[PDB]
Amino acid sequence: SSKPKYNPEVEAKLDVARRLFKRYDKDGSGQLQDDEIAGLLKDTYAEMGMSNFTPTKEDVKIWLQMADTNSDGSVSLEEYEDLIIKSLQKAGIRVEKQSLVF
């Protein structure tokens, strides 16, 4: 149970999906639909800069379940963030863990 803490180069990749997420969630309750994720990613990647690299449906189902803990059965932004990470690796983007020093 680790948080999305990576280099400042990859972190920016999450800020994008975070700005587009709210653009989809009409309920404005920080919650989004799963079936909408497929289409949401289409515009997400574009803003991320990733080209010629679409998130496979076989993988998406995995990323969701990986964060589909015991709940109503919906997808939120908190989970949608970590998803992008695994979706970026498939493209060939190496993401390592970093830690600041107080």
Explain this structure to me?
With 102 residues, the chain is mostly helical. The chain is built from four helices and two strands, in the order αβααβα. It has one domain: EF-hand (Recoverin, domain 1). It starts with 7 loop residues before the first helix and ends in a 13-residue tail after the last helix. Ca(2+) 4 binds at residues 68, 70, 72, 74, 79. Ca(2+) 3 binds at residues 25, 27, 29, 31, 36.
Compact summary:
By secondary structure, the protein is mainly alpha-helical. Helices cover 53% and strands 4% of the residues.
Structural class: mainly alpha
The strands making up the biggest β-sheet line up spatially as: 1-2
Number of domains: 1
H/E element sequence? HEHHEH
Q: Report on the biggest sheet.
A: 2 strands, antiparallel
Q: What's the total count of β strands?
A: 2
Global morphology: globular
**Gyration radius from CA atoms, angstroms:** 13 Å
Question: Portion of residues in helices?
Answer: 40-55%
CATH topology: Recoverin, domain 1
Number of continuous helical runs = 4
Distance between the termini: 23 Å
CATH level-four homologous superfamily name:
EF-hand
Portion of residues in beta strands equals under 5%
Question: Any idea of the CATH class?
Answer: Mainly Alpha
For the record, the CATH architecture stands as Orthogonal Bundle
Draw up the topology in text.
Layout lengths: L7 H17 L6 E2 L2 H14 L8 H10 L8 E2 H13 L13
Antiparallel strand pairs: 1-2
Helix pairs in contact: 1-2, 1-4, 3-4
Protein name: 10 kDa calcium-binding protein
Organism: Tetrahymena thermophila
